[PDB]
Design a protein around this ligand. Structure first.
Ligand SMILES: Cc1cc2nc3c(=O)[nH]c(=O)nc-3n(C[C@H](O)[C@H](O)[C@H](O)COP(=O)(O)OP(=O)(O)OC[C@H]3O[C@@H](n4cnc5c(N)ncnc54)[C@H](O)[C@@H]3O)c2cc1C
Length: 295
């Protein structure tokens, strides 16, 4: 039922870019693009929580072809237009430091993708992933802990849950549980999909809670910058109570290293009731209720 490896690196699907939109508003930090591809002409199917591979053009420094990079799918199974013809990605351009040979370094695949033109052909493989899948139980609670481009799988869940067109397209899934996104970004113009996230929250104030951790605008109790582990510590007892429900699924996505501050906060909460969090969490992973994808 879960499509996997419909296309592989030795014979990739050749899609076409339909659009390439900026997500970072003026005054923000960096470049994050929303890129939509045309899937017509092939049989690429996917569901929510999966990834695809992109094979960038060119050779490395040794003259060898560039390998694929993985990207979380940022659209539901139906695509943004709910026509089952497209797939979207949420791609940040990577760039960095002088302690790494010379001046500024730009990432190969992320630069390629963020500057790609409509009409261009792209090599796509996949889909892959069974770790970040959404339960078909419409009464599930869904906690979502994302930083930056980790919003991508969260967007596929929330759109499936709350978009009018999706609800009309998925008769089997009419969500009536509770979902909570805690979203860590550096500035307000860096809140990816801010307007659509806040529109969901106003239509479904009982089913969706939105919490931001904006580090350049908010300070934590110790006077430091507000990060997502600070918000999670702030709400640790509430999050723990929701996690005790047999229906609750937790998803964590973003850059590696966000997991340690989340566990330290949930450990202190669980300890209050004599529960050892690290042992409890192993049973949650075994049960398929604890989903992690950091990179
Ligand atoms: C499952 C999965 C899902 C992903 N989803 C997404 C997504 O939705 N959106 C997205 O933008 N990315 C996503 N990523 C990362 C994406 O995989 C590519 O790794 C990332 O875009 C950078 O690739 P690059 O090709 O731009 O190239 P590269 O040119 O390959 O650069 C990466 C290399 O440069 C180095 N490097 C990186 N940062 C620094 C730093 N600050 N200081 C020093 N050296 C550094 C490391 O050696 C690293 O191997 C995902 C990764 C995985 C594994």
């Amino acid at each position: 039922d879960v499509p996997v490896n419909l296309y592989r690196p030795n014979a990739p699907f050749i899609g076409k870019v339909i659009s390439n939109e900026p997500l970072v508003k003026e005054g923000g930090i960096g470049i994050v693009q929303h890129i939509k591809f045309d899937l017509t002409g092939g049989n690429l199917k996917y569901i929510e929580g999966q990834s695809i591979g992109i094979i960038p053009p060119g050779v490395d420094k040794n003259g060898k072809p560039e390998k694929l990079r993985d990207y979380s799918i940022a659209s539901t199974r139906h695509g943004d237009d709910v026509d089952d013809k497209t797939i979207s990605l949420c791609v940040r351009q990577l760039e960095y430091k002088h302690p790494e040979s010379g001046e500024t370094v730009y990432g190969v695949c992320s630069t390629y993708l963020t500057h790609i033109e409509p009409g261009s052909e792209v090599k796509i493989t996949g889909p892959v992933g069974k770790e970040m899948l959404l339960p078909d139980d419409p009464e599930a609670n869904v906690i979502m802990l994302a930083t930056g481009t980790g919003i991508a799988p969260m967007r596929t869940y929330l759109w499936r849950m709350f978009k009018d067109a999706e609800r009309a397209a998925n008769p089997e899934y009419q969500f009536k549980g509770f979902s909570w996104l805690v979203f860590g970004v550096p500035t307000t113009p860096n809140i990816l999909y801010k307007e659509e996230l806040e529109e969901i929250q106003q239509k479904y104030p009982d089913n969706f809670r939105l919490t931001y951790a904006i580090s350049r605008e908010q300070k934590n109790p110790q006077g430091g910058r507000m990060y997502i582990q600070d918000r999670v510590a702030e709400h640790a007892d509430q999050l723990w109570q929701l996690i005790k429900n047999q229906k609750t699924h937790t998803y964590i996505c973003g850059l590696r290293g966000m997991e340690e501050g989340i566990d330290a906060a949930l450990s202190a909460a669980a300890a209050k009731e004599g529960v050892t969090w690290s042992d409890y969490q192993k049973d949650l992973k075994k049960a398929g209720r604890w989903h992690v994808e950091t990179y």
